[PDB]
Amino acid sequence: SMSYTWTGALITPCAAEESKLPINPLSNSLLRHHNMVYATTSRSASLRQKKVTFDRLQVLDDHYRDVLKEMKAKASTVKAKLLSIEEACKLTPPHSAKSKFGYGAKDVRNLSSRAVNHIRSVWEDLLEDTETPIDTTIMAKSEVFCVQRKPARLIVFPDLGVRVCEKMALYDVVSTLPQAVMGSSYGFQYSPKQRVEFLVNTWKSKKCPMGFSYDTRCFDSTVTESDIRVEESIYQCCDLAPEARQAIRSLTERLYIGGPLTNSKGQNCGYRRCRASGVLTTSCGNTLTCYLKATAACRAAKLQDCTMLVNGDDLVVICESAGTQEDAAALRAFTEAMTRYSAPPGDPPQPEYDLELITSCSSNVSVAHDASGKRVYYLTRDPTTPLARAAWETARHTPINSWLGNIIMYAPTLWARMILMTHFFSILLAQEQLGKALDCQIYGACYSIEPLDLPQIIERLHGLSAFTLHSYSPGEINRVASCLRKLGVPPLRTWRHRARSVRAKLLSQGGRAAICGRYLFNWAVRTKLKLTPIPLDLSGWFVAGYSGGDIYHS
Numbered sequence: 001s002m003s004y005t006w007t008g009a010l011i012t013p014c015a016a017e018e019s020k021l022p023i024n025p026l027s028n029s030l031l032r033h034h035n036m037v038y039a040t041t042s043r044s045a046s047l048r049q050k051k052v053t054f055d056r057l058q059v060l061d062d063h064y065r066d067v068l069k070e071m072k073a074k075a076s077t078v079k080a081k082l083l084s085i086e087e088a089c090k091l092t093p094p095h096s097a098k099s100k101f102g103y104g105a106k107d108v109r110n111l112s113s114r115a116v117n118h119i120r121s122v123w124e125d126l127l128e129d130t131e132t133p134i135d136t137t138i139m140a141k142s143e144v145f146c147v148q149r150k151p152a153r154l155i156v157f158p159d160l161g162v163r164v165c166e167k168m169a170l171y172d173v174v175s176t177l178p179q180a181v182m183g184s185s186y187g188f189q190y191s192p193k194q195r196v197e198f199l200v201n202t203w204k205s206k207k208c209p210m211g212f213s214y215d216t217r218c219f220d221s222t223v224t225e226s227d228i229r230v231e232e233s234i235y236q237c238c239d240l241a242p243e244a245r246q247a248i249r250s251l252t253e254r255l256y257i258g259g260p261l262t263n264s265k266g267q268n269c270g271y272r273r274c275r276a277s278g279v280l281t282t283s284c285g286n287t288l289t290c291y292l293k294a295t296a297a298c299r300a301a302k303l304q305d306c307t308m309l310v311n312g313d314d315l316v317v318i319c320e321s322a323g324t325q326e327d328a329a330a331l332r333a334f335t336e337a338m339t340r341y342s343a344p345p346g347d348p349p350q351p352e353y354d355l356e357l358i359t360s361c362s363s364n365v366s367v368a369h370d371a372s373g374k375r376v377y378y379l380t381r382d383p384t385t386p387l388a389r390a391a392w393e394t395a396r397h398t399p400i401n402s403w404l405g406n407i408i409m410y411a412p413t414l415w416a417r418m419i420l421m422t423h424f425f426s427i428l429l430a431q432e433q434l435g436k437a438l439d440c441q442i443y444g445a446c447y448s449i450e451p452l453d454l455p456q457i458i459e460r461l462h463g464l465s466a467f468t469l470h471s472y473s474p475g476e477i478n479r480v481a482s483c484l485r486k487l488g489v490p491p492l493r494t495w496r497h498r499a500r501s502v503r504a505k506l507l508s509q510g511g512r513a514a515i516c517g518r519y520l521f522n523w524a525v526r527t528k529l530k531l532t533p534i535p536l537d538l539s540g541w542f543v544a545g546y547s548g549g550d551i552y553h554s
């Protein structure tokens, strides 16, 4: 069937859209070539609609059915909890889209009567009505990139009231089931240093390893009604409260498998028969679907000892080599199988025989050395997009931000350390906001974090070596260097000069600021200070990992 059908009504914005990087002193100190940085808008939405709209031809086979039953046998060990309205409300992001029913995310969080009464009514409706399609809004998402232009991504989400009900029925499921089903291959359970450990150990565990990332084109659109019902069949193997079982069955038929699209102006926009980007089960569902399809395709292709690492639609496979011609051919057979499964490639996959050449989760493993000269593996990526976004959020007030999560994810990197930390710490210090908690977007989720806690966070997510790395690899330095010339970012000597200046200010204030000076900026001085383990709340991160978007943790 068609992933989408359209009536001709437009994908509308509900406010003016900015597509150019403003000319502003603070962002200009970071990046000079402002004309290279752009934000997507609803003006490119029709181009995206064309790409995401197509017919899906799915053909399932014995390997798929075998793998599906192996997954269900493991899902069968799961016992899941129904969340109370209060628990689901506290998981609601503060700046989450308001309901069209007279209340907003803050009213939800405060347990206001209007909000709670309405959420309760929505829940009872899920229990009563198993068929009426649930309305969704379609919007063009505003995302920032560097030229060489991407059309806007389209986001699909239901009303606030429904989102809170999804958490009630399925939060515990999305947070515990993927690990029970996929074990070590479930990527979202890992901190960055633990993802590196698994990739390095899996690689080292093969006699002759071969690995590849697999890019599925427009994954959400490739997701069929069958996939979504199969996904539900895995959820139904959990021990569930009667009302959760019903709310899952109703959400699946009324929301998950598809439904009507309304634009911001309230106009009937079209119809969806594929994955909605903005529902609770998107991340877990995509992960389970991508894992099932890949696991079965490996058997079909006869790849050997194929270890998966799956994070939503992001896939990396590491296996035993059968020789070079054999590998090329088996990988083409793997692609042919995924294609029948309705998971066709975007960029053709290629076999790799070096772990550092594989890009997965938009990152690659690289190597540096700690103060004692020992090798430390860590994740990095091309810094273009992170720098373009840091510049945009510097010039444009963003009640939400992406730069802080970037520093946390990429802390051991040369670029996050010399540029990002230096830049944002200089500014927050001048503005007396080092201590101000920020609402940090990490993938689709939300975390409240004070910049002053960065050292403790980094030491846990990456180890104390993140503050001592040096001797980065030539390829990494090469890549960083070329991006700075391309974006007009001042050279590293200038960032060193800035860091020394902010480091001295951080030290002079003492307290938590001085801890930031000592750990975050020790790379910038000779007279290194003693780096000992720093004398919290990492549970919301560690117990379930990243369980999906529109989730808030404090």
Ligand SMILES: CCCCN(C)C(=O)c1c(F)cccc1OCC(=O)N[C@H](CO)Cc1ccccc1
Pocket: 187, 188, 189, 190, 191, 192, 194, 195, 311, 360, 361, 362, 363, 379, 380, 408, 409, 410, 442, 461, 540, 541, 542, 544, 545, 546
């Ligand atoms: C819990 C969500 C926020 C806490 N962060 C930031 C995490 O990492 C994280 C964590 F600390 C504990 C548990 C799970 C976590 O994350 C899930 C996940 O898939 N993370 C990956 C790394 O494995 C992010 C990443 C991908 C590529 C390159 C660099 C970093």
